[PDB]
Design a protein around this nucleic acid. Structure first.
Lengths: 136, 116, 50, 177, 150, 45, 75
RNA sequence: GGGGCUGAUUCUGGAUUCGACGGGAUUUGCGAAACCCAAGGUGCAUGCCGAGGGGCGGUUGGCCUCGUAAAAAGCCGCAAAAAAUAGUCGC
RNA sequence: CGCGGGGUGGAGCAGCCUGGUAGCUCGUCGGGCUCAUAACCCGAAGGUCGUCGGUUCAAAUCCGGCCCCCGCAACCA
RNA sequence: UGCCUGGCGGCCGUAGCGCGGUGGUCCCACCUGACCCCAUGCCGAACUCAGAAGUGAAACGCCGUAGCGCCGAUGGUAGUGUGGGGUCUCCCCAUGCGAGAGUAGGGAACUGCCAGGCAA
RNA sequence: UCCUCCUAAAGAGUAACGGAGGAGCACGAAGGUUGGCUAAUCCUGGUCGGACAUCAGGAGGUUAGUGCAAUGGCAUAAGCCAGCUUGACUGCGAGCGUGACGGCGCGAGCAGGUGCGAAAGCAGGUCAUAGUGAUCCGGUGGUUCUGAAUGGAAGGGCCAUC
RNA sequence: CCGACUUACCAACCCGAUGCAAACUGCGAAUACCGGAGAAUGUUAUCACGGGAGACACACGGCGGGUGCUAACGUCCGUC
């Protein structure tokens, strides 16, 4: 599970998921999975996508996860009225903009990795596409 | 460093002289020389400058850079100052402690007739 | 609070005084500061009071 | 000024023929020895430093000097601004004869002498020496004293390299073991 | 004072000769429960091997529970801080088949657990009848003595 | 350099009792005769 | 355990560049020393730069460290 | 489920378990492990091959040993390892 | 806020006043005491009298203060 | 005027560092000496005075050096003013402003006054 | 109730039972002036002393410090040390910012008068921003200002203040 | 035990590369806001003073946000 250590602030504002991705393309590995849809990736979604992606190779290669939640989202308890402060911490999502490389893999053939990211894409909420290593 | 460590002490003195728009009276000390200049409030044009590095003034003195040389040029630069009608100055310490040679230089300008 | 107000009356015969604070516990000694008296139009010593 | 005249004639012409000094200021010169006795345990009692200063009292012109704490340390039960040690900064003319009272006559007064270290350097070319006790000085008569307080002495010369300063030490009878 | 539960019944069963004021090392949950928190002392003895004099019979349970993760048992062989003078002499006069070191009382010495320990000798029951007789013998003797003055 | 707070001075003349004389300015006290000189200091044998 | 906040002190700039004001008019309210004294500008007890004389306010950056200066040209 | 209270006698700063125990350091006696220098002794030995290892098997990735091959030492499971390993009371 | 007194051995109480030449006992240690301790018996110790000044031949005393323990009616910002 | 140095500035990283050569004639620094002027939580280090024998070591200055810092396009892009539109939690179009960052590169300063030195 | 940051959308300002925190003091010096000096944290080496003392050497750069929360600041130091002092003085004060108002703040300069420094200069408090309640009531000192037929006095007004 | 070799890996410094921040900023707009200059046009639109008011329960839409589930013909601000 992905989780920050000693965060500067326990609660933070909602914010607006606006703009495009500040992560460019494949840098570490050889093959990547770049997100196309705009949304938020929870920490439980990434690990569940990680297990299905790593299932195809079963140990092989290394999977460079280029994203991290680092954003706690509060949820009020059930059957309480509005107001009375802010809810506590429940889960941690990642602000994902379109054009963001999610996972990078290397040391495996591209044919095997194609289903590996696609099976990860089923567990992932957002629509994504397989990308290769960038040129120049 | 003893040079630039002294300079930052003199920076406080030089701020007051230029902010108030007052003509300063600067000095400079050498193991064998002494220097004293009159500097306009413009900060880049110097009006009166007489020192013991001058060959026409050091030849009347035995040693350049002692109390007798500072008092010789303190009176000399003051006479040129009153020839321009200059009467409003403030003695810049220039980082040096106001006890001895720099002090005895300024009293010679006080002796010649310039108050500051 | 532990620093209490006092009355700083002058050494002259004028009834004019000053009102400031001192710590009796920290400083058992009294204050003697040559302030300005407006009645005398000069400087005299000032002694504490209650 | 006893060995300084020995330094000015013998050692100076030795050093410029040693490292090929083409300048008369290029030869390193001994300038200061820093005599510090960090007794330390005078946190509660003043007499563990005042008598330490009184045991220190026999070097330079006049009254003794103590130090202050650098900062607050819980481990040795000290706080900020504490008289802890006593130090001496001896540079100039009066520190020359102290060498003969330290390197010529105190060395035979060393209990169980074997040899001085040659690898105790500040990096720039300055040696730091250490004595276990104080009896090696001729000043103490070992009658009215009550302590065996040693005192670190660091000699700081105008050396560029460590062996260049060591060449100055070799010219001033350093027992390199 | 700061006394804790004491083995007064040990005086009926044992006739301890020499005492000690050795200290006892104890865990963090023990100190809170020691002032109050139901510490018991019955059947307290020792289990020395080399220098491992342990207060054996000491039932002290945590009143307010301060136990997490790893285990915490109310009855333990707590290590005694014994002097080396008091240590080598217990290779001798405690190994005599009946000789033991018991703790008469438990207390504090300025927020430190110091336990009054003593070298018990142990009474057989044939001389237990004599001591109870003797205690009644001392009382009834002066009763006869006071009847001269009535 | 400053004034009056550097450990005190007392001029003597000394000499070792082994045929070696070390007569310098010192700060010991009244006077003292030394016992061991550097020439007899055993760092050679 | 929140909602406790102070009241705003109305800091900032009162007169901009090119504006002519009389003596004693407050130029800039500030806490630190972001704006420094140039000409005819004095610094108050609480870093209140006040107009020493008449003229227009000039914002200038001078010095080795390029500190901001407020100066008054008596025009 | 929420709120309050209490959480080692100091309850607001100066913990010093009087102790073997775990730890560091100092002094002290000096040791191929707390070391190197072929020099004093000192001419025929060392290393790798071959080579077996106490009672059994193995054993230091290396040993007390072997002038070209079957005997000799530390150690591992084996085996001489002991028992009311405080008291006190019983059939 | 200004009315009533007392502060003295480690402790609690007197001498003071009706002037000058400070004690008592509780807690202590010293001994006796004792199959054992103790009951109980005595031996010894301690503050110049809360503090600072004045009067007085003479201040612990008396008077001036100041400080402390309080007690008191006040107590309508 | 030229070559220098020193004193005072403008602007203040293209103006700052690292590294390599440079200078003592004048100047400057180191220095020499110090009862006395005077300095001091210490010993003429610094501070202070009296001299200048020696040195350019060090400092400082100049030159080289982009080995770094720094400045920096054109364009593109983000963002946004206003006006409309959509699958109106986000975008598109029209028009207006236009980055940051990076890239091409630029650059190891420049400028004003006064005094002595040497060449004129 | 007040102060600091964000929320707050680059003037100021702007709410919620929105998100983080502080204050109900402290200093007679921690004030003013004059003069001086410049941290953190490391490794180099040295008697106790070792990771943590005392001393010297360099890196390093104010991540230090600023009585105290954050923010904005500060080496020209607003940081630190020493010298001498009370300007933590009085009567004013052009002109401003701030609020519905009551109210709060800045302020050169004038006069009296003081301290520091030779001097220009600085000081009518603390690096700044919280450290605090209006009026009435009554207490205290000063002031004839008034004082009831007059003379005082009582009682008030005013100024200082609780 | 010796301990030689080996090791997924847990691991600070230093550097390179990659992302996130309302309470991070060495960068930095658009507009907004203030002041000055100018012509056009506006039955003064400006300010001050005096008399009389009502009003201090807003709502939705657009935009910038807090909050709520970027759920509410939801709530709380700014803006038209």
């Amino acid at each position: 599970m992905l989780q920050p250590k000693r965060t500067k602030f326990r609660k933070m504002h909602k914010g607006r998921n606006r703009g495009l991705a500040q992560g460019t393309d494949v840098s570490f590995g050889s093959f990547g999975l770049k997100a196309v849809g705009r949304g938020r990736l929870t920490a439980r979604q990434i690990e569940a996508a990680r297990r299905a992606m790593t299932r195809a190779v079963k140990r092989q290669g290394k999977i460079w996860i280029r994203v991290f939640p680092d954003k706690p989202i509060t949820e009020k308890p059930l059957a309480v009225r509005m107001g009375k402060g802010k809810g506590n911490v429940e889960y941690w999502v990642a602000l994902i903009q379109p054009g963001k490389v999610l996972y990078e893999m290397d040391g495996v053939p591209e044919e095997l990795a194609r289903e590996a990211f696609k099976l990860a894409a089923a567990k992932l909420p957002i629509k994504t596409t397989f990308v290769t290593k960038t040129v120049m | 460093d003893k040079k630039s460590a002294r300079i930052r002490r003199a920076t406080r003195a030089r701020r007051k002289l230029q902010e108030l728009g007052a003509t300063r009276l600067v000095v400079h000390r050498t193991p064998r020389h002494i220097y004293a200049q009159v500097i306009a409030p413009n900060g880049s044009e110097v009006l009166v400058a007489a020192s013991t590095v001058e060959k026409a003034i050091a030849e009347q003195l035995k040693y350049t850079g002692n109390k007798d040389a500072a008092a010789a040029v303190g009176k000399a630069v003051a006479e040129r100052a009153l020839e321009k009608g200059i009467k409003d100055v403030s003695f810049d310490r220039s980082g040096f402690q106001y006890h001895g040679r720099v002090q005895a230089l300024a009293d010679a300008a006080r002796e010649a007739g310039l108050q500051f | 609070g532990i620093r209490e107000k006092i009355k700083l009356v002058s050494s002259a015969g004028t009834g004019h005084f000053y009102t400031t604070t001192k710590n009796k516990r920290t400083k058992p000694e009294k204050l003697e500061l040559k302030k300005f008296d407006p009645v005398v139009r000069q400087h005299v010593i000032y002694k504490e009071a209650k | 000024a006893k060995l300084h005249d020995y330094y000015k004639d013998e050692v100076v012409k030795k050093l410029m023929t040693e490292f090929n000094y083409n300048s008369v200021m290029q030869v390193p010169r001994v300038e200061k020895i820093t005599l510090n006795m960090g007794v330390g345990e005078a946190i509660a009692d003043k007499k563990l430093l005042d008598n330490a200063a009184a045991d220190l009292a026999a070097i330079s012109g006049q009254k003794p000097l103590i130090t202050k704490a650098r900062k607050s340390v819980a481990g040795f039960k000290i706080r900020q601004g504490y008289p802890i040690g006593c130090k001496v900064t001896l540079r100039g003319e009066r520190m020359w004869e102290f060498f003969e009272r330290l390197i010529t006559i105190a060395v035979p007064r060393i209990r169980d002498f074997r040899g001085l270290s040659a690898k105790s350097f500040d990096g720039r070319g300055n040696y730091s020496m250490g004595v276990r006790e104080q009896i090696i000085f001729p000043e103490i008569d070992y009658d009215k004293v009550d302590r065996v307080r040693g005192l670190d002495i660091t000699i700081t010369t105008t050396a560029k390299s460590d062996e260049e300063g060591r060449a100055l030490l070799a010219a001033f009878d350093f027992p390199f073991r | 004072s700061a006394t804790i539960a004491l083995n007064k019944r040990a005086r009926h069963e044992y006739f301890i000769e020499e005492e000690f004021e050795a200290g006892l090392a104890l865990q963090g949950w023990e100190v809170k429960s020691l002032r109050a928190g139901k510490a018991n002392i019955s059947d307290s003895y020792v289990l020395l091997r080399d220098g491992e004099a342990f207060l054996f019979g000491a039932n002290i349970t945590p009143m307010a529970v301060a136990s997490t993760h790893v285990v915490c048992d109310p009855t333990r062989t707590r290590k005694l801080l014994l002097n080396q003078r008091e240590l080598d002499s217990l290779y001798g006069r405690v190994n005599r088949e009946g000789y033991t070191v018991v703790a008469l009382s438990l207390y504090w010495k300025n927020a430190w657990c110091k336990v009054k320990i003593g070298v018990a000798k142990g009474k057989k029951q044939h001389d237990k009848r004599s001591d109870i007789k003797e205690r009644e013998w001392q009382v009834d003797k002066a009763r006869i003595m006071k009847n001269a003055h009535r | 350099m400053k004034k009056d707070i550097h450990p005190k001075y007392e001029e003597i003349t000394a000499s070792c009792s082994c045929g070696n004389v070390m007569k310098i300015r010192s700060t010991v006290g009244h006077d003292l005769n030394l016992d061991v000189c550097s020439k007899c200091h055993p760092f050679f044998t | 355990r929140n909602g406790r906040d102070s009241e705003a002190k109305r800091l900032g700039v009162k007169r901009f560049g090119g504006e002519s004001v009389l003596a004693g008019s407050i130029i800039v309210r500030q806490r630190g020393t972001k704006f420094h004294a140039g000409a005819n500008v004095g610094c108050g007890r609480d870093h209140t730069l006040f107009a020493k004389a008449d003229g227009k306010v000039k914002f200038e950056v001078k010095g080795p460290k390029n500190r901001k200066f407020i100066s008054i040209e008596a025009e």
